[PDB]
Amino acid sequence: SMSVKKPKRDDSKDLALCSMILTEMETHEDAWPFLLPVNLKLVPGYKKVIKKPMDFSTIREKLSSGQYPNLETFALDVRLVFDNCETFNEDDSDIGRAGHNMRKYFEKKWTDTFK
Template identity: 40%
Template sequence: AIGYFKKQGFTKEITLDKKVWMGYIKDYEGGTIMQCSMLPRIRYLEMGRMLLKQKECVQAKIRAYSKSHNIHAPPKEWKNGITEINPLDIPAIRASGWSPDMDELARQPRHGPNYNQLLHLLNDLQNHNSAWPFLVPVNRDDVADYYDVIKEPMDLSTMESKLEADQYLTPEDFIKDAKLVFDNCRKYNNESTPYAKSANKLEKYMWQQIKAIPEWSHLEPER
């Protein structure tokens, strides 16, 4: 759900004074508090009509300077049908520096073949009720010796950044970082703590999700 609310303008950075909301809203362990700032001058219920009016005003201004809205008859050269030409024969295209390779690059997928499934898995992990200790990096100010003990820190937000940067070429690369999150937690925290228990629950959930993907069945850990 966090990813959905981010798209709607919500953020995890809470700037609203705690005394305004603390004790008035349901705040439970494992939940993620999010905030959406709203501008008093904006009438959100009239947003659709307002945007339509703005669009009409912008288009009216454009028409005052542009002739693009005028419709012309097709050129006489098209009378006998359209013939294929080399785009580079058009001076403006040639001057722009365009090349056929650019079209080929534009058609290539933005992310690797595993991106969508890994993103879905990561979102499932982030939204799990045991994910709360692992959503962001451990705060050095809160846990002074953490980075003395844990030499390879990892968290779900860092994994999200790496996924968007296409640093996970294979599912194995993703799982390696996920296991690092859980192993680090168990290394630093006693097994009886809520943190270690959350790591065990979230790791178990991760393997359940992986097991549900047939082409990833070989990734299951040996028992």
């Protein structure tokens, strides 16, 4: 509350550490469905159904231009990529399986880097 703060967690390395995580997501072999925005002219249904499209390249631009106020807003966008994927893709598809794999990979890196 006012003049009453928990001890200051060091957040000065977060920007760099989120960048490294993102690099590792970008270079994973199952990243291909997620590297670029879904083409809304060429994929019927996507525009109407997925209210908030997100992809790695868009997260990378937001990161690089100070549009994440803190590390939680960064994790929310990464998770949004996989939640979108689950909304549009059958579990038993290459893309559906890619999303489950990438989400797992991300969540471990997140816990190991920050928890």
